[PDB]
Amino acid sequence: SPLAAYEVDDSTGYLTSDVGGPIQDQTSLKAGIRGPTLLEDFMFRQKIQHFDHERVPERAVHARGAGAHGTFTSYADWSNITAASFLNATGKQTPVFVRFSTVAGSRGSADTARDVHGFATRFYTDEGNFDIVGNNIPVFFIQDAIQFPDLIHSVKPRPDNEIPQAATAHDSAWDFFSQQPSTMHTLFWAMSGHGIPRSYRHMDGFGIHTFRFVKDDGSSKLIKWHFKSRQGKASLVWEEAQVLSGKNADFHRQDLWDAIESGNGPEWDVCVQIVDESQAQAFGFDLLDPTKIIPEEYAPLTKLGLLKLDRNPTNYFAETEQVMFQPGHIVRGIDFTEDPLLQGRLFSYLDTQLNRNGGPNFEQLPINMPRVPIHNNNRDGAGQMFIHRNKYPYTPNTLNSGYPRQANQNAGRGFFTAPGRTASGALVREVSPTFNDHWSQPRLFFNSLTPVEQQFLVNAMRFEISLVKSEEVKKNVLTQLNRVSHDVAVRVAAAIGLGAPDADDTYYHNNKTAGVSIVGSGPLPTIKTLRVGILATTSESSALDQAAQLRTRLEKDGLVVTVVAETLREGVDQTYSTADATGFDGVVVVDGAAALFASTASSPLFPTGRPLQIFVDAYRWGKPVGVCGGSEVLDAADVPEDGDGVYSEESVDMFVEEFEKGLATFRFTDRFALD
Amino acid sequence: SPLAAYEVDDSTGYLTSDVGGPIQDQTSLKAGIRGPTLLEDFMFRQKIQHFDHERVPERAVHARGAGAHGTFTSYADWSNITAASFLNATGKQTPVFVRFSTVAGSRGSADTARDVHGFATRFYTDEGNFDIVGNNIPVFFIQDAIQFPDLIHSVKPRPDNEIPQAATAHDSAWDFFSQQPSTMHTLFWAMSGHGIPRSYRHMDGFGIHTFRFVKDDGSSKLIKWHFKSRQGKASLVWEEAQVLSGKNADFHRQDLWDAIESGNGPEWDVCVQIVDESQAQAFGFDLLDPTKIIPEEYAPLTKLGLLKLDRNPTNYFAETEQVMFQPGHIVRGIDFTEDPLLQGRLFSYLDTQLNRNGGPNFEQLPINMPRVPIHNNNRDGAGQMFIHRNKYPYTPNTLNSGYPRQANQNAGRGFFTAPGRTASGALVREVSPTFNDHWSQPRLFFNSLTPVEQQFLVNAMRFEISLVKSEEVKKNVLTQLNRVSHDVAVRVAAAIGLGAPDADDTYYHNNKTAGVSIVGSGPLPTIKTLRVGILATTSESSALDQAAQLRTRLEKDGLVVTVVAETLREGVDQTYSTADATGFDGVVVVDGAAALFSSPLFPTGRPLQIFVDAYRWGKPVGVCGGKSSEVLDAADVPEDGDGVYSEESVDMFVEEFEKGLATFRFTDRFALD
Ligand code: HDD
Ligand code: HDD
Ligand SMILES: [Ca+2]
Ligand SMILES: [Ca+2]
Ligand SMILES: [Ca+2]
Ligand SMILES: [Ca+2]
Ligand SMILES: [Ca+2]
């Protein structure tokens, strides 16, 4: 509603100033036709002042990201576990807006950097805006919010030269990770495929912190939020991610945009783990510690409702850039915990909007407005867009008949702090000793990945640590990695020419947990939206016919098909010059195009070797690949015909049926070497 | 540093607040060891408030860039042509700060996007700060500053979804270009290798506009600024730039930073073309039109002095992010012209600093301060750092004895407007008809490029225009291109499966001009700083030995050598896993590593792909040690190719290879239409 009221249509009409005076804006007013521009040209100055002031500070973290509208629908009346109004009835719908992001990069940095990712969700509830400001990884680097600028200074570019962009592959970051062992768990997640998701739709969301569900009788339970993807879990490989950062920095935002435009809006089951207050230390670690997960073997997930994103913004700046999330946007039926990471966040997100917005009335921007009436005695401030009719904005008053009325647990559906909560003890700047195991869970996570996934994680660390210049930092990194796993430390040390420290088995173990592996999570549950590149030629009308035949068969099943040839024409979407294997989830060469794949093939229309390099890159990166028409191509690529995920069929139908199974498998991991 | 007065050392001492109270900053204050955080924790709040407020708006354009300090030295007393103090004596030195940039991308976008580039120079003169806010292309897309938001909206990402980053390769940009034909000249420059320079040190800087030099006696002449690189002109190739944008988004800033750190700070001759006022229309176009160059054949360059950058910043945000350039930072001896693009800039750069700084005292930031006293009656404002002793800040006054005194042509070395300038006519919002030829100069430029360079430009256009979804926009683009060159139109049209319109010869010609070609600009004058990747192996102790010997011989000549192998050790800089051909200007394989040409330590095929990419992209490549055929045959690289080297002798190999680094690119490796 606040959005619809502020939509501005410029599909017709004459140009006006911001005060509705019709004007022009194409030629400056000058003293003669070859003369100096005049100060009295208000048309020039208003247009250029606006331009000059377009930009606002980027977000201090998560500067790079993209958003969409949708709806949350409750599966049930959840009154038995929370008073939350948005959860109080089967089928109850609440509008949402979600923004997804990286963490370290500035605006304009690439989507496919290796990083932690944001997953921030606003529920415009009938009892106020409720935000769950989460990440795609369920644990955080640090245990106390006061350390956030340390973490973030260390990962962001070195501040003398501002190098490197959007990367932890520098001395300072690994200096911090090695000195602050709490970082191990999130580190291991970021060095897995969770640091390079295939799309925002193929990752989960996590609140990280323990929160409370509070009932209308005052009782509480402890919860963790999990948003579980209905699209499946999928990652890129690092070598692919690096090329994609160059070829399409906008890959995740375009994937989102496109999925929504085609009627394939992504979905998640909004879930919780729910445990009793008495179980704060029962699972072998402290539920106040944001570097720990509750293994699902100890507390299963309950599905609360469906999150669907199905509408793109109208103006990115107004909606996506200006959305201002806060964990302080809480509603009756939810409460905080004493997680010292959460506790400090509550301060930060209120304060930082003053930086972004430049003034205190940021909740008035349409994307930040609620969908219920606002009744309070907040007044004035720069940018004040309301005209308040209550001329006695103080409590207690008689002159406004004691309105607005105080809301609390007893009346008015007020927020209230869970009334069972207490504090006791000295006023301290001390870390709880219950937070001191920094290594067991990183090992739990590592144990739960498949062998090739473990290899990819090792290889990520090998990559990044080999770029650390400091020999001491690199030694200190091995010291910490060795506390998680001696084998990781040895394997990583081998790439950097150092020896690993001797095994220290204090935290070693062989326990695993379900639901953290990407490679182990089975085939994708849908292939709709996945991209197939068909490599063809204009030389041979046979090639274009085969391509068209595959197109119809793949499109029917919701795949996005790109036919690539030397030059554009009817049925060809993309020239070889602009094509890359990073643009596809699977690649098919029509056998009529075989000539383009020869070592001597050359054209002024694309770079030498491009058609073959698309095919070979796709294969090396694990993708389903094949040749359709029943040979030259598989041999030019040194691609084995018997390999899993390599397809070779004369029959278009048999080809598509086999090829679509391989898109669901998504990645053929047998093509990656192990230690 | 020139900013040493403002430096803060933290190499010793105990943590303090901003008001000097010693504190801690690692644990929050809590009501109990597992308790909630306390509002009274001022340590937490001051630290997190600062964090929360670290960011400032990026620049509205040229958001992505990097800078360095240096010195300008005059070659002579230029009293003959300008009263400018910084140019008034042979050997006179003035500190400078320079920022280079792209145009369209935000912060964090890649250095090697295809774009126009900024080259902004501040001279901290003894008569005030003087800025030349230029680009690496000598002409601008548009003819009136009022149009700047239109250009920039069209080239920046589409505003519904903010896609694409740092790119003209989208419908809106090509829509604007094809509807505003003024854009042709800059567009051809940007679609040339001038859109993807090899480094900031391998590009020139241009003021674009005609300015005036003004002597103390009031007379004036018309000038164009040219800063001509002493490193040579060089570009990337587009495939290479695309990969490099992913592998190293910081490539230009690192190149610069490393050059300075190694004592190879980049140099430019600061030059002008100098013509009489009576020549404003004499060259076949109007000197007020920023879409035109004065061909060097009509007005030669005069060298004024030397620009050398030789000191990197101490704090990037404080120095580079905060530097606030303005064309209104002008000094006695220089004046403006009635170029309608320049005229409107003067407003923009003073105003925009209010957005960036959040208040009016942005000239007090250390990087913005002048190196001479300030005497004026500007007062107050947020962030005011000065404590003014004059309590009568108005003119005219008696109560401060009439100080500060007015400065003008005749007293106090004042700035003064060139007194021969006049204006005549109606007050109009009309374009001079003298601006109307949008197409001849683009053709002049295109004609001046070599054949392969012409092909690269065609190829950049084919790449971008093929991404334009609108058939109508594509057709309109072909219409404009065809007015520059029919052949360009035909060759671009072929890629996008449309027919070019028939020849329209109104603006066609065969004239050329010197100094605009990159490919034609001959070997580089220096190879110092250029990057040689030596691909080796740890399996064979002789391969490491070969690499060490090559390293020695190459480093002697000031090349930056990287030895690559499977794993790090003594003498090996980089693993195959982190290496890429975009990291090198030439690639050498030692023949002890020939067996590499699969492993858990690097992606399949990586060693050979580095060599093959390097060859495909034009670089000098070769095999040192005598046995070349196994590597060269694996690569499909012909032993007899130009810029392909095979020698057993390390000296012979390096002597040959260095000639190839100076040639820089072997253009025979690219197909022509
Ligand atoms: C004490 C400070 C602090 C700490 C410990 C954290 N953050 Fe935060 N976060 C910020 C301070 C902050 C911020 C500076 O206040 C940002 C920048 C922009 C904004 O609105 O808030 C932010 C932004 C931000 C966003 C982007 C929201 C958007 O798309 O606009 C996400 C997703 C997160 N954070 C998620 C997390 C998670 C899951 C954390 C740990 C569980 C976390 N942050 C800890
Ligand atoms: C009407 C406005 C307008 C017009 C016509 C131009 N510019 Fe500009 N330019 C700006 C308005 C602007 C600005 C909005 O004022 C910026 C953003 C940051 C700043 O300080 O000024 C800017 C920044 C900016 C910078 C970055 C300086 C730095 O590194 O901080 C360079 C190099 C240029 N411009 C160069 C040019 C050149 C060579 C132009 C034409 C000859 C040009 N601009 C026309
Ligand atoms: Ca660093
Ligand atoms: Ca993976
Ligand atoms: Ca567009
Ligand atoms: Ca402000
Ligand atoms: Ca004057």
What pairing do the DSSP bridges indicate for beta strands B302-311 and B65-74?
Answer: antiparallel
Partner A, chain B 435-494, Cβ-Cβ below 8 Å: 455, 459, 462-463, 466-467, 494
* Contacts of B554 by beta carbon, 8 Å cutoff, 6+ apart: B532, B561, B654
- Nearest CA among B317, B236, B673, B288 for reference residue B485: B673
Q: Which two tokens stand for residue B244?
A: 């490099």
Phi and psi based region of residue A32 (left: phi greater than 0; alpha: psi -120 to 50; beta: remaining): left
**Alpha carbon A359 to chain centroid distance?**
28
Q: How far apart are the first and last CA of chain B?
A: 53
Which site among A50, A144, A163 would you substitute to test the B interface, given the most B Cβ atoms closer than 10 Å to its Cβ? Answer: A163
- Nearest CA among A262, A273, A253, A301 for reference residue A526: A262
Q: Cα–Cα distance between A558 and A664 in angstroms, integer?
A: 13
> Do residues A413 and A435 share a domain?
no
Cα→Cα distances A101→A183, A192, A330, B397, Å: 20, 18, 22, 59
Active site residue B135: yes
CA dihedral sign, ordered B329, B333, B336, B342: negative
Q: Cα–Cα distance between B547 and B143 in angstroms, integer?
A: 55
Q: Cα–Cα distance between A465 and A240 in angstroms, integer?
A: 19
Q: Cα–Cα distance between A572 and B637 in angstroms, integer?
A: 32
Q: Which two tokens stand for residue B293?
A: 């160059």
Method of structure determination: X-ray
Structural domain including B535 reads 527-673
Contact A627, A619 (CB under 8 A): no
Q: Is A424 on the interface with B (CB under 8 A)?
A: yes
Q: Which two tokens stand for residue B589?
A: 């394989």
> Do residues A405 and A437 share a domain?
no
Q: Cα–Cα distance between B660 and B647 in angstroms, integer?
A: 14
Q: Cα–Cα distance between A150 and A159 in angstroms, integer?
A: 13
**Is the minimum distance from the CB of B50 to ligand 1 under 6 angstroms?**
no
Distance B583 CA to ligand 1 centre (A): 35
Find the ligand nearest to B409 CA.
7
Cα angle B457, B458, B463; round to 5: 95
Amino acid symbol at A347: F
Reduced to 3 states (helix: H, G, I; strand: E, B; else coil), residue B122 is strand
Q: Which two tokens stand for residue A316?
A: 């990115």
Q: Is A306 on the interface with B (CB under 8 A)?
A: no
Reduced to 3 states (helix: H, G, I; strand: E, B; else coil), residue A125 is strand
Instruction: Output DSSP code: residue B593.
Output: G
DSSP secondary structure, B285-315, as one string: S-TT-TT----TTTSPPEEEEEEEEEE--S-
The CA-based diameter of chain B, rounded to the nearest angstrom, is 90
Contact A364, A66 (CB under 8 A): no
- Which stretches within A289-378 are classed as H helix? 316, 340-357
**Alpha carbon B141 to chain centroid distance?**
17
Where among B427, B450, B484 does a domain terminate? B427
CATH of the domain at B646: 3.40.50.880
Q: Cα–Cα distance between B483 and B442 in angstroms, integer?
A: 10
Give the H or E element holding residue B371. none
Q: Cα–Cα distance between B395 and B416 in angstroms, integer?
A: 19
> Do residues A255 and A118 share a domain?
yes
Q: Which two tokens stand for residue A150?
A: 């340390």
> Do residues B421 and B554 share a domain?
no
Contact B263, B241 (CB under 8 A): no
The CA-based diameter of chain A, rounded to the nearest angstrom, is 91
Q: Cα–Cα distance between B443 and B315 in angstroms, integer?
A: 44
Give the H or E element holding residue A646. strand A646-649
Instruction: Output DSSP code: residue A37.
Output: B
**Is the bond leading into A295 cis (omega within 30 degrees of zero)?**
no
Indicate the resolution in Å: 1.4
Contact B165, B105 (CB under 8 A): yes
Q: Cα–Cα distance between B607 and B543 in angstroms, integer?
A: 14
Find the ligand nearest to A359 CA.
6
Q: Cα–Cα distance between A132 and A345 in angstroms, integer?
A: 12
Contact A328, A349 (CB under 8 A): yes
Say whether A144 and B26 touch across the interface (CB within 8 A): yes
Cα→Cα distances B257→B201, B252, B260, B619, Å: 11, 9, 5, 23
Cα→Cα distances A490→A10, A196, A494, B146, B538, Å: 63, 24, 6, 63, 18
Contact B142, B153 (CB under 8 A): no
Cα→Cα distances A15→A24, A158, A488, B177, B340, Å: 6, 46, 64, 21, 22
Reduced to 3 states (helix: H, G, I; strand: E, B; else coil), residue A105 is coil
Q: Cα–Cα distance between A500 and A503 in angstroms, integer?
A: 8
The residue assigned the tokens 């911001």 is A18
Q: Cα–Cα distance between B360 and B367 in angstroms, integer?
A: 15
A 10 A CB-CB count for B449 gives 21
> Do residues B403 and B470 share a domain?
no
* Contacts of B142 by beta carbon, 8 Å cutoff, 6+ apart: B148, B150, B151, B180, B182, B183, B291, B341
> Do residues B455 and B522 share a domain?
yes
Amino acid symbol at A105: G
> Do residues A273 and A422 share a domain?
yes
> Do residues B361 and B470 share a domain?
no
Q: Which two tokens stand for residue B63?
A: 């958001």
> Do residues A324 and A362 share a domain?
yes
- Nearest CA among B597, A165, A603 for reference residue A612: A603
Cα→Cα distances A142→A181, A436, A593, Å: 9, 12, 54
Reduced to 3 states (helix: H, G, I; strand: E, B; else coil), residue A454 is helix
**Is the minimum distance from the CB of A60 to ligand 1 under 6 angstroms?**
yes
> B105: which chain A residues are within 8 Å (Cβ-Cβ)?
108
DSSP secondary structure, B546-584, as one string: HHHHHHHHHHTTT-EEEEEESS-BTTB-EETTT--GGG-
CATH of the domain at B394: 2.40.180.10
CATH of the domain at B451: 1.20.1370.20
Say whether A605 and B145 touch across the interface (CB within 8 A): no
Q: Which residue of A has its CA nearest to B113?
A: A246
Cα→Cα distances B468→A610, B73, B158, B528, Å: 21, 48, 13, 41
Contact B81, B88 (CB under 8 A): no
> Do residues B348 and B493 share a domain?
no
Contact B302, B346 (CB under 8 A): no
What percent of the residues of chain B are helix, what percent strand, and what percent coil, each to the nearest 5? 35, 15, 50
- Nearest CA among B336, B91, B341, B338 for reference residue B214: B336
* Contacts of A372 by beta carbon, 8 Å cutoff, 6+ apart: A125, A126, A127, A128
Give the H or E element holding residue A184. helix A184-191
Residue A16, beta-bridge partner list:
A22
Where among B468, B498, B526 does a domain terminate? B526
CA dihedral sign, ordered B281, B283, B285, B287: negative
DSSP secondary structure, B213-272, as one string: EE-TTS-EEEEEEEEEESS---B--HHHHHHHHHH-TTHHHHHHHHHHHTT---EEEEEE
**Alpha carbon B503 to chain centroid distance?**
36
What pairing do the DSSP bridges indicate for beta strands A427-428 and A334-335?
Answer: unpaired
> Do residues A466 and A542 share a domain?
no
Q: How many domains does chain A have?
A: 3
**Separate counts of helices (H) and strands (E) for chain B:** 16, 18
- Nearest CA among A365, A314, A318 for reference residue A54: A318
Which ligand 1 atom sits closest to the C-alpha of A135? 38
Contact B166, B105 (CB under 8 A): yes
Contacts 24+ apart (CB under 8 A), A563-566: A563/A534, A563/A536, A564/A533, A564/A534, A564/A535, A564/A536, A564/A611, A564/A614, A565/A536, A565/A537, A565/A538, A566/A537, A566/A538, A566/A539, A566/A596, A566/A603, A566/A605, A566/A606
Where among A427, A455, A484 does a domain terminate? A427
* Contacts of A85 by beta carbon, 8 Å cutoff, 6+ apart: A125, A126, A127, A331, A332, A333, A413
Q: Which two tokens stand for residue A471?
A: 């020999």
> Do residues B457 and B554 share a domain?
no
Contact A104, A141 (CB under 8 A): no
CA dihedral sign, ordered A313, A319, A320, A321: positive
Q: Cα–Cα distance between B322 and B58 in angstroms, integer?
A: 10
Q: Cα–Cα distance between A612 and A576 in angstroms, integer?
A: 10
Q: Cα–Cα distance between A453 and A118 in angstroms, integer?
A: 23
- Shortest CB distance from B107 goes to which of A107, A145, A320? A107
Contact B585, B577 (CB under 8 A): no
What pairing do the DSSP bridges indicate for beta strands B65-74 and B267-276?
Answer: unpaired
* Contacts of A161 by beta carbon, 8 Å cutoff, 6+ apart: B66, B253, B254, B257, B312, B313, B316
- Shortest CB distance from A146 goes to which of B47, B148, B250? B47
* Contacts of A472 by beta carbon, 8 Å cutoff, 6+ apart: none
What pairing do the DSSP bridges indicate for beta strands A302-311 and A65-74?
Answer: antiparallel
B644-647 β-sheet, strand order: B574-575, B560-565, B531-535, B586-590, B621-624, B644-647
Report phi then psi at B160, rounded to 5: -80, -40
Find the ligand nearest to B153 CA.
5
Cα→Cα distances B283→A649, B286, B443, Å: 67, 8, 16
Burial status of residue A276 (CB atoms within 10 A of its CB: 0-12, 13-18, 19 or more)? exposed
Cα→Cα distances A315→A250, A312, B23, Å: 17, 9, 45
Strand extents, DSSP E, A204-332? 205-206, 211-214, 220-229, 267-275, 302-311
Catalytic residue among B69, B129, B135, B185: B135
Cα→Cα distances B332→A579, B372, B414, Å: 54, 15, 6
CA dihedral sign, ordered A560, A561, A562, A568: negative
Q: Cα–Cα distance between B393 and A268 in angstroms, integer?
A: 65
CA dihedral sign, ordered B620, B624, B629, B631: negative
Residue A72, beta-bridge partner list:
A94, A307
Q: Cα–Cα distance between A12 and A279 in angstroms, integer?
A: 63
Q: Is A640 on the interface with B (CB under 8 A)?
A: no
Reduced to 3 states (helix: H, G, I; strand: E, B; else coil), residue A270 is strand
Q: Is B277 on the interface with A (CB under 8 A)?
A: no
Catalytic residue among A135, A312, A357, A361: A135
Amino acid symbol at A73: T
Cα→Cα distances A646→A122, A462, A532, A625, B537, Å: 43, 29, 14, 5, 32
